[PDB]
Ligand SMILES: O=P(O)(O)OC[C@H]1O[C@](O)(CO)[C@@H](O)[C@@H]1O
Ligand SMILES: O=P([O-])([O-])O
Ligand SMILES: [Mg+2]
Ligand SMILES: [Tl+]
């Protein structure tokens with residue numbers, strides 16, 4: 105009660121004996137500040153009249169909400185004043201953002217300031233997603249620095265603005281969950297070294313696209329509904345916000361799917377700031393994440409707004425699906 109394991113202490117006690125410049129702590133502290141401010145805005149957006157659009161479209165196709173702009177400004181301003189980043193990639197920005205020389209640090213940050221756009225006006229769980237890369241190159245910071253495979257992630261996670269506000273942080277040694285104490289504005293450790301179940305009992309996809317689905321997806325869904333071995337069929341769940349569906353997959357187990365489809369070869373979700381962070385978290389928890397043909401973290405992007413199919417969750421559920429794709433290959 106008078107001893108709190110906050111995110112700061114953890115990340116500090118984390119990279120301690122293995123020292124470091126400490127700018128990961130500065131990065132994560134700064135981020136936490138932006139997530140706290142987004143959280144307070146969301147919890148009263150109707151009053152504050154934050155619902156509604158911004159009158160703008162993203163890079164490939166999205167209707168920019170007021171909360172998109174707000175959350176985007178916050179995350180950028182705090183990452184910049186952290187002195188720990190050099191290249192920023194945002195869903196909301198066409199081009200990568202280069203940090204002014206004076207405030208530059210060594211990290212590249214890819215983020216979705218607010219994910220789950222379609223769920224905002226109905227008060228369903230929304231979130232923030234981030235992926236952090238160390239800049240390798242020794243030359244001047246540029247968009248290219250963001251064009252790294254998710255395998256090179258140093259840190260990844262998301263803020264979920266659900267019934268409680270949660271910060272899920274994945275780093276090289278594992279996954280940790282931090283819940284926001286609204287009274288003292290601190291992210292506190294509630295779940296240490298999170299591991300996903302080997303197999304779940306929930307499947308999660310927008311079956312409104314059944315008509316475009318590939319035979320592999322089609323077959324898998326039928327098998328969830330009609331188990332060949334007479335086991336209980338899987339329950340269905342699709343919140344509509346990636347951060348919510350993925351967090352349920354993490355803690356409950358099972359599978360989440362936004363596959364490629366007859367109209368969308370690379371699916372819908374963005375590899376840099378949507379699929380890679382979640383792929384990373386999922387694998388740090390003992391899970392898998394795939395396109396149906398290749399691991400998401402092994403893809404080498406060519407476009408900061410590149411799309412990727414993604415299938416993630418319990419290794420055995422993900423593998424069952426993979427077998428089905430292989431069989432249809
Ligand atoms: O309505 P659809 O096509 O299922 O889109 C849902 C997905 O869109 C996103 O909002 C990304 O735009 C994800 O949060 C969510 O999983
Ligand atoms: O809008 P989003 O973020 O994509 O969901
Ligand atoms: Mg967004
Ligand atoms: Tl957007």
Ligand SMILES: [Tl+]
Nearest residue numbers: 218219220221
């Ligand atoms: Tl959004």
Ligand SMILES: [Tl+]
Nearest residue numbers: 372373374378
């Ligand atoms: Tl998207």
Ligand SMILES: [Tl+]
Nearest residue numbers: 162166195374
């Ligand atoms: Tl998007």
